[PDB]
Design a protein around this motif. Structure first.
Motif, PDB file in Angstrom:
ATOM      1  N   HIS A 288      19.191 -35.689   4.170  1.00 23.73           N
ATOM      2  CA  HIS A 288      20.092 -35.674   5.200  1.00 23.73           C
ATOM      3  C   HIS A 288      20.581 -34.206   5.678  1.00 23.73           C
ATOM      4  CE1 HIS A 288      22.803 -37.443   8.074  1.00 23.73           C
ATOM      5  NE2 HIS A 288      23.874 -36.807   7.607  1.00 23.73           N
ATOM      6  N   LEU A 289      20.850 -33.550   4.862  1.00 29.01           N
ATOM      7  CA  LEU A 289      21.223 -32.105   5.128  1.00 29.01           C
ATOM      8  C   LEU A 289      20.129 -31.499   5.469  1.00 29.01           C
ATOM      9  CD1 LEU A 289      23.849 -31.359   2.085  1.00 29.01           C
ATOM     10  CD2 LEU A 289      24.358 -32.327   4.375  1.00 29.01           C
ATOM     11  N   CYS A 290      19.292 -31.273   4.914  1.00 33.41           N
ATOM     12  CA  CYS A 290      17.913 -30.902   5.493  1.00 33.41           C
ATOM     13  C   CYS A 290      17.516 -31.021   6.705  1.00 33.41           C
ATOM     14  CB  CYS A 290      16.518 -30.941   4.520  1.00 33.41           C
ATOM     15  SG  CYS A 290      15.109 -30.057   4.978  1.00 33.41           S
TER      16      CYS A 290
ATOM     17  N   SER B  97      19.429 -31.744   9.257  1.00 32.09           N
ATOM     18  CA  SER B  97      20.533 -31.147  10.129  1.00 32.09           C
ATOM     19  C   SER B  97      19.875 -29.575  10.582  1.00 32.09           C
ATOM     20  CB  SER B  97      21.742 -30.964   9.378  1.00 32.09           C
ATOM     21  OG  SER B  97      22.529 -30.318  10.390  1.00 32.09           O
ATOM     22  N   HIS B  98      19.362 -28.950   9.573  1.00 28.02           N
ATOM     23  CA  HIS B  98      18.836 -27.584   9.717  1.00 28.02           C
ATOM     24  C   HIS B  98      17.526 -27.652  10.589  1.00 28.02           C
ATOM     25  CE1 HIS B  98      21.723 -25.295   6.996  1.00 28.02           C
ATOM     26  NE2 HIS B  98      21.833 -26.377   6.438  1.00 28.02           N
ATOM     27  N   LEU B  99      16.802 -28.790  10.360  1.00 26.33           N
ATOM     28  CA  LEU B  99      15.659 -28.696  10.886  1.00 26.33           C
ATOM     29  C   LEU B  99      15.598 -29.153  12.258  1.00 26.33           C
ATOM     30  CD1 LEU B  99      13.146 -31.015   8.691  1.00 26.33           C
ATOM     31  CD2 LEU B  99      13.025 -28.667   9.343  1.00 26.33           C
TER      32      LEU B  99
ATOM     33  N   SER C 257      20.932 -20.177   4.856  1.00 27.96           N
ATOM     34  CA  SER C 257      21.418 -20.402   6.416  1.00 27.96           C
ATOM     35  C   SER C 257      23.093 -20.321   6.483  1.00 27.96           C
ATOM     36  CB  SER C 257      20.887 -21.806   6.860  1.00 27.96           C
ATOM     37  OG  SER C 257      21.553 -21.988   8.130  1.00 27.96           O
ATOM     38  N   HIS C 258      23.671 -21.112   5.469  1.00 27.59           N
ATOM     39  CA  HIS C 258      25.105 -21.219   5.238  1.00 27.59           C
ATOM     40  C   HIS C 258      25.755 -19.579   5.103  1.00 27.59           C
ATOM     41  CE1 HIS C 258      25.759 -25.483   5.432  1.00 27.59           C
ATOM     42  NE2 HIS C 258      24.712 -25.451   5.114  1.00 27.59           N
ATOM     43  N   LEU C 259      25.133 -19.038   4.252  1.00 29.92           N
ATOM     44  CA  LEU C 259      25.531 -17.562   3.889  1.00 29.92           C
ATOM     45  C   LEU C 259      25.642 -16.642   4.866  1.00 29.92           C
ATOM     46  CD1 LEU C 259      23.817 -16.910   0.329  1.00 29.92           C
ATOM     47  CD2 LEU C 259      26.223 -17.042   1.000  1.00 29.92           C
TER      48      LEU C 259
ATOM     49  N   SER D  67      30.314 -28.332   4.164  1.00 26.54           N
ATOM     50  CA  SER D  67      30.194 -27.693   5.383  1.00 26.54           C
ATOM     51  C   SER D  67      29.612 -28.812   6.687  1.00 26.54           C
ATOM     52  CB  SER D  67      29.202 -26.385   5.197  1.00 26.54           C
ATOM     53  OG  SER D  67      29.134 -26.212   6.704  1.00 26.54           O
ATOM     54  N   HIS D  68      28.856 -29.630   6.271  1.00 22.55           N
ATOM     55  CA  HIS D  68      28.334 -30.644   7.258  1.00 22.55           C
ATOM     56  C   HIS D  68      29.426 -31.489   7.485  1.00 22.55           C
ATOM     57  CE1 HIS D  68      24.028 -29.124   7.404  1.00 22.55           C
ATOM     58  NE2 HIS D  68      24.427 -28.521   6.278  1.00 22.55           N
ATOM     59  N   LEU D  69      29.870 -32.008   6.215  1.00 24.11           N
ATOM     60  CA  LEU D  69      30.855 -32.966   6.673  1.00 24.11           C
ATOM     61  C   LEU D  69      32.088 -32.774   7.621  1.00 24.11           C
ATOM     62  CD1 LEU D  69      31.387 -34.407   3.014  1.00 24.11           C
ATOM     63  CD2 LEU D  69      30.619 -35.577   5.062  1.00 24.11           C
TER      64      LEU D  69
ATOM     65  N   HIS E 227      29.213 -27.685  -2.142  1.00 18.84           N
ATOM     66  CA  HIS E 227      29.844 -26.843  -1.029  1.00 18.84           C
ATOM     67  C   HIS E 227      29.206 -26.642   0.078  1.00 18.84           C
ATOM     68  CE1 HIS E 227      32.093 -23.378   0.299  1.00 18.84           C
ATOM     69  NE2 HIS E 227      30.869 -22.525   0.509  1.00 18.84           N
ATOM     70  N   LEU E 228      27.975 -27.099   0.166  1.00 16.50           N
ATOM     71  CA  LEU E 228      27.067 -27.096   1.293  1.00 16.50           C
ATOM     72  C   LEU E 228      27.413 -28.135   1.952  1.00 16.50           C
ATOM     73  CD1 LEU E 228      23.600 -25.318   0.223  1.00 16.50           C
ATOM     74  CD2 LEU E 228      25.820 -24.246   1.136  1.00 16.50           C
ATOM     75  N   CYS E 229      27.220 -29.337   1.305  1.00 15.50           N
ATOM     76  CA  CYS E 229      27.282 -30.712   1.853  1.00 15.50           C
ATOM     77  C   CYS E 229      28.788 -30.597   2.731  1.00 15.50           C
ATOM     78  CB  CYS E 229      27.423 -31.866   0.867  1.00 15.50           C
ATOM     79  SG  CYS E 229      27.830 -33.488   1.528  1.00 15.50           S
TER      80      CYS E 229
ATOM     81  N   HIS F  81      16.667 -22.076   0.704  1.00 15.90           N
ATOM     82  CA  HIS F  81      16.474 -21.785   2.026  1.00 15.90           C
ATOM     83  C   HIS F  81      17.583 -22.280   2.983  1.00 15.90           C
ATOM     84  CE1 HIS F  81      14.502 -20.797   5.787  1.00 15.90           C
ATOM     85  NE2 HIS F  81      14.642 -22.214   6.228  1.00 15.90           N
ATOM     86  N   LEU F  82      18.207 -23.539   2.685  1.00 18.63           N
ATOM     87  CA  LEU F  82      19.387 -23.970   3.384  1.00 18.63           C
ATOM     88  C   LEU F  82      20.659 -23.043   2.935  1.00 18.63           C
ATOM     89  CD1 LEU F  82      18.505 -27.823   2.792  1.00 18.63           C
ATOM     90  CD2 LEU F  82      17.728 -26.258   4.775  1.00 18.63           C
ATOM     91  N   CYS F  83      20.775 -22.908   1.845  1.00 21.19           N
ATOM     92  CA  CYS F  83      21.942 -22.122   1.297  1.00 21.19           C
ATOM     93  C   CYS F  83      21.845 -20.986   2.005  1.00 21.19           C
ATOM     94  CB  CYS F  83      21.946 -21.897  -0.071  1.00 21.19           C
ATOM     95  SG  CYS F  83      23.101 -20.753  -0.814  1.00 21.19           S
TER      96      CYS F  83
HETATM   97 CL   LIG Z   1      22.580 -27.803   3.157  1.00 20.22          CL
END
Ligand SMILES: [Cl-]
Ligand SMILES: [Cl-]
Ligand SMILES: [Cl-]
Ligand SMILES: [Cl-]
Ligand SMILES: [Zn+2]
Ligand SMILES: [Zn+2]
Ligand SMILES: [Zn+2]
Ligand SMILES: [Zn+2]
Ligand SMILES: [Zn+2]
Lengths: 30, 21, 30, 21, 30, 21, 30, 21, 30, 21, 30, 21
Positions: free
Chosen positions: C5-7, C9-11, E9-11, I9-11, I5-7, E5-7
């Motif tokens: 689900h998170l991936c 979002s980035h996609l 993006s946040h960084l 952010s989306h939340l 921590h990443l989740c 890769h996702l991390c």
């Molecule tokens: Cl993420």
């Protein structure tokens, strides 16, 4: 739900959220 | 398009759903 | 975890940038 | 699907371009 | 999964906010 | 590297400041 | 690729995507 | 800087690449 | 990994859209 | 907490609405 | 830290980052 | 509210912290 102008990637994340498993179509200059 | 409907103008959740599959 | 689900979002945000005027369809299924 | 290919392995901008209309 | 890769993006988004005018270099390597 | 330190463990704004120019 | 003004964190995510493994440098007030 | 080139003005993908390492 | 921590952010971005004027409290604890 | 429920399983917009004030 | 107007989801991500484990409250129309 | 303080106007990190729990 938010009541503001949704532009750029913000409109895409809103569609992603709102449509969920239904998926969505983003075609701007249609 | 959705850009003019929801970015240029404001869209309610219902109107945003018009672009869901 | 909700890794898929998170991936997603980035996609879609990445497709927004990559596709531009061409638009795109996002079908979490298939 | 875009999720199965790009969430398993990193897809570059060039690879993502395949999913554009 | 593409956890790295996702991390990333946040960084970079976080560095944008934290660094401000100072700017920053993002080298996925090293 | 910033990826190896901050993607392994959470880096606070203060820790992220080290990677600024 | 999108043809719009890229600002704030949006310019950083675009660089992140576009540059890939090459990495990038974000220095605004240079 | 990149801000005035790509945020104030519009940058093509090629111009955006000028800021890649 | 920093999956939590990443989740998060989306939340919060999702709550921004979902809650709108209603606002929300984000307590990573509890 | 919102993290324990929504980071374990996907929460839809409808489920997320519970955490609004 | 960045010195720009923080709006929409951008203000929420800034709070998320800045407040860390403390958590935060986002109430716009208070 | 925070919107008028930090979105309409500019907020320093310290002012942003006023909205932390
Ligand atoms: Cl993420
Ligand atoms: Cl118009
Ligand atoms: Cl200018
Ligand atoms: Cl005002
Ligand atoms: Zn924005
Ligand atoms: Zn228009
Ligand atoms: Zn993410
Ligand atoms: Zn300028
Ligand atoms: Zn105001």
């Amino acid at each position: 739900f938010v009541n503001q102008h949704l532009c750029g990637s913000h409109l895409v994340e809103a569609l992603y959220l709102v449509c969920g498993e239904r998926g969505f179509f983003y075609t701007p200059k249609t | 398009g959705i850009v003019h409907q929801c970015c240029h103008s404001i869209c309610s959740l219902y109107q945003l759903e018009n672009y869901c599959n």
